[PDB]
Each structure stands twice: as structure tokens, then as C-alpha cells.
Amino acid sequence: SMSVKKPKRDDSKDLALCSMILTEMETHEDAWPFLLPVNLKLVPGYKKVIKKPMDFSTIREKLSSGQYPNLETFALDVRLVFDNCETFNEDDSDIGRAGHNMRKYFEKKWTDTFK
Ligand SMILES: Cn1cc(C(=O)NCCN)ccc1=O
């Protein structure tokens, strides 16, 4: 509360660590469904069904222009990519399985980096 300061973690490296985590995502071989925004004019149903589209390049742009206030909002956009994926794809499709793989890949790097 007011004048009651909780001891807080060092966040000076958060930007560089999130950038390196995103780089590992972008270079993962299963990252192809998520590198670029879903083409709303070439895919039937996505614009209406998916109310918050998100992809790695948009996350990269928001990270490179100071649009994430903290690292929690960064992980929100990353998880939004895979939440959208589950909403729109079957689990045993190539894209649906890539999302599950990429999500598990992310959450371990998130724990190994900040926890
Ligand atoms: C990540 N993601 C990719 C597609 C896509 O590109 N579909 C083309 C079908 N061959 C659709 C939904 C989704 O969430």
C-alpha cells in the first residue's frame, strides 16, 4: 500500500530475456503457423471467431517498440497465440499439434528463465 514498499525483483534484464526467448520461439521448427498474422482475407472464419489475433511478428514488433509494460503482459500475448490456436484448430492437426508443442516449449523456457 501507500509507503509500504514490497521488495521487488530486478527487472532490468527482462527486455533482453524476453527477446531471447522470442528468438528461440521464432527459430523453432514448429513455429511456422505463428510467425506471421493469420491472413484474415484468405482463411474462412478466423476474423469472426478469433477476437484477438496474435502472432510472433506482432509480439516482436510490440517488444521492439516498448509496448509491453512488464514481462507478464509479454507472456499474455505469447499464450494468446496458443489459446487462439487451440480455439481454431484440432489438437491432432499439424497446426494444432504445433501449438501444443510451442506452448510447452515456451512455458519451460519461461520457468527456466524467470522462476
Ligand atoms: C495458427 N493458425 C494457422 C491457420 C492456417 O494457416 N490455416 C490454413 C489451413 N491450411 C489457421 C488457424 C490458426 O490458428
Side-chain angles (χ1 to χ4, degrees):
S1 60
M2 202 188 317
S3 303
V4 179
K5 309 122 201 151
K6 188 215 278 278
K8 274 322 292 149
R9 51 174 302 277
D10 191 5
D11 61 0
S12 61
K13 289 288 164 183
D14 284 1
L15 183 59
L17 294 165
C18 286
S19 175
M20 81 113 162
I21 292 180
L22 186 57
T23 291
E24 313 215 50
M25 309 280 280
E26 294 159 329
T27 61
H28 194 300
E29 97 169 69
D30 294 356
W32 55 269
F34 319 105
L35 295 173
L36 296 182
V38 172
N39 195 323
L40 301 179
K41 273 63 198 175
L42 302 186
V43 57
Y46 201 88
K47 185 183 163 52
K48 183 58 175 296
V49 168
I50 304 300
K51 308 315 260 290
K52 301 202 277 225
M54 187 58 58
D55 64 292
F56 293 168
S57 71
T58 301
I59 297 170
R60 173 62 72 185
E61 183 62 35
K62 292 175 64 178
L63 195 63
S64 295
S65 58
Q67 300 191 52
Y68 291 119
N70 46 62
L71 76 178
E72 287 106 350
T73 59
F74 167 84
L76 282 189
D77 271 2
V78 177
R79 284 155 190 168
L80 175 56
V81 173
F82 308 133
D83 288 350
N84 292 338
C85 191
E86 268 193 281
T87 290
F88 204 80
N89 298 275
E90 292 283 343
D91 294 338
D92 297 295
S93 53
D94 291 313
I95 295 176
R97 184 49 54 182
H100 288 303
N101 287 3
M102 289 299 301
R103 183 200 294 276
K104 167 69 80 164
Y105 188 73
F106 167 71
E107 303 295 350
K108 183 190 176 46
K109 309 216 93 67
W110 195 251
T111 300
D112 291 354
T113 294
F114 298 110
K115 296 300 193 297

